[PDB]
A paper describes a structure:
In the wild-type HpSK, the guanidino group of R57 forms hydrogen bonds with the two carboxyl groups from E53 and E60. Replacement of the guanidino side chain with a methyl group at this pocket eliminates these interactions in R57A. Instead, E53 from the SB domain forms hydrogen bonds to the guanidino group from R132 (E53 [Oε1]-R132 [Nη1]: 2.21 Å; E53 [Oε2]-R132 [Nη2]: 3.58 Å) located at α6 (CORE). The R57A mutant structure shows a notable shift of the SB domain owing to the interactions between E53 and R132, rather than those between E53 and R57 in the wild-type structure, revealing a crucial role for R57 and R132 in defining the best active-site geometry to accommodate promising substrates.
SK catalyzes the specific phosphorylation of the 3-hydroxyl group of shikimic acid, using ATP as a co-substrate.
Numbering used by the authors: 1 to 108, 122 to 162
Amino acid sequence: MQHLVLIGFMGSGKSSLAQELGLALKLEVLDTDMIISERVGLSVREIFEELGEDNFAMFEKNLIDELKTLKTPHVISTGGGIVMHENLKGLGTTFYLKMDFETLIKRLLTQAKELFEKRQALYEKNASFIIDARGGLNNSLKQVLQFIA
């Protein structure tokens, strides 16, 4: 609960922001996309295609509990599977990196819009803080650094 937890959709650019936020604050950064792929042995993309998003999200939800094992404060990029998460706020201060749907869509249909709407509601229910992604990585970073001050 002094972990800084970047949460948001996959493709939102949280991993890269995490990297740069760690560097700025002299903190280690952990990316649950990385851990899950490292431990499962398959790429994010293969897990998504062969096992589905619900199972990615399960992988993530099980890693969260382990992440409270951490003796030091970390930047943690996670939340690609918010559907399965109950309250990652118990992991630390969570920042939702909020991107509009059309912009998320470019970086990666009525059914996708439906999903996006439902999951955004979960992200902001799980967020201690909201960072507006529209302005790009450094403007998101400034936002996070301003919350910290």
